[PDB]
């Protein structure tokens, strides 16, 4: 299959197997008081499309990565432009994580979506800087995967919308995440709604002569975006 949205087209297989986060689809907001006064913007032309990050290199020594949204998209394309200004923001996402690996590679990756995912201090009160809350497009790497760096067991990470990537069976995973918040609109700049996490649970293994590093590619498609008054 080939998925074509706007001017971007990605190669991927067609499988009805996906993970709806919590079981609901992205939706446009139920009409509110503020947006009845000013009708919000629902762009899809060049705005809602596939964005593909710099791929990550998984090696035998790795820990794993996380991303924060909307943040990862705050400087990109025409979404980051609308993400700037526009003091009101709402959106869902379509996340596809891919792995290019030969049949001779073995390992597995846990892939999850955590709402309001808060990295804590490893110390006193070392309030974690803007680097852990806003790592940007590149993302961050975990220090203590076993606790997720939240003080929480990774064993129990499976009450979050998730999919395994087992280099034996499947090389890809797709998670549909609706907008999840305690308020219909929020600020995309100072608040990250959720975060995405890829942790190797079983480390990468290969025999000498194989490639020592396996790339992980992320692809982000916004769904049902809405933007507010222009800053």
């Amino acid at each position: 299959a080939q998925l074509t949205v706007g001017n971007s087209s990605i190669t991927t297989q067609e499988a009805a197997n996906i993970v709806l986060a919590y079981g609901e689809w992205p939706e446009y907001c139920p009409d509110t008081d503020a947006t009845a006064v000013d009708k919000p913007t629902r762009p899809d032309v060049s705005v809602n499309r596939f964005y593909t990050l710099d791929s990550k290199m998984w090696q035998e020594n790795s820990t794993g990565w996380y991303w924060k949204f909307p943040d990862v998209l705050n400087k990109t394309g025409v979404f980051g432009q609308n993400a700037q200004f526009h003091y009101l923001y709402r959106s869902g996402f379509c996340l596809h994580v891919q792995c290019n690996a030969s049949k001779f590679h073995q390992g597995a990756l846990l892939v999850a979506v955590i709402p309001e995912f808060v990295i804590a201090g490893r110390g006193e009160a070392p309030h974690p800087g803007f680097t852990t809350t806003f790592p940007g497009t590149t993302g961050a790497t975990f220090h203590d995967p076993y606790v997720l760096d939240s003080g929480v067991p990774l064993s129990q990470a499976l009450i979050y919308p998730h999919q395994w990537i087992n280099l034996r069976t499947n090389n890809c995973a797709t998670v549909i995440v609706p907008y999840i918040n305690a308020v219909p609109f929020d600020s995309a700049i100072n608040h990250s709604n959720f975060g995405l996490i890829v942790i190797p649970v079983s480390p990468l293994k290969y025999s000498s002569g194989a490639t020592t590093a396996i790339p992980i590619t992320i692809t982000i498609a916004p769904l049902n975006s809405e933007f507010g008054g222009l800053r």
């Binding site: 709402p115 808060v118 009160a125 003080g151 929480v152 009450i159 999840i180 308020v183 100072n190 608040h191």
Partner: protein
Amino acid sequence: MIETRCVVNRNGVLETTINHFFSRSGLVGVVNLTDGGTDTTGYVTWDIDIMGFVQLRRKCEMFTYMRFNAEFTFVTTTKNGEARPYMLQYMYVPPGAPKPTGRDAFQWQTATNPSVFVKLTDPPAQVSVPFMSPASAYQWFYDGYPTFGCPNNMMGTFAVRVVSREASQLKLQTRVYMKLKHVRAWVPRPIRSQPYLLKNFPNYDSSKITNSARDRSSIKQAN
């Protein structure tokens, strides 16, 4: 214990509901009031906070979002505990309102702060506080910068004093009991496996990390 047998039947399903799991009024704080004239303050303020004790803190951090009404009960006694007929005042201070600066200060007479006057020989006073947040729920996990003062999701504050013209030398402690009611919860979390370092933040000791299961001799032997 006792009574060792096998239970072949399904249990009652009602005890596992979220609303029953957060019910059962319990102790949310202890504050101490000495009315000493000018050498001692003579009143107390207690900010409303659920996380002050880690038992119930661990049960709210199972979820991302919650909604509920609170019901408070004040059990107040004097030192040795023998009670005498002294009037008291529990004033509630809504979010975004100035708190008492002193015993006789003008804030105690503000009408928008609702109060209750009850003698110390009476049964303990009960009060019902609604859902106070400007969002649709309280959230103790917020990824971003809240700043702005102390715990998250400010419910209010209680202040207690004795009602008299002259300071009565009296040493009080008021136990506060809270019962959550009409509780809704969203987006469940994993339960914390690490000790809490400090309030308001999910810090953990990086050097010493505890493991979720205890240890055994070998993997090939169960018992």
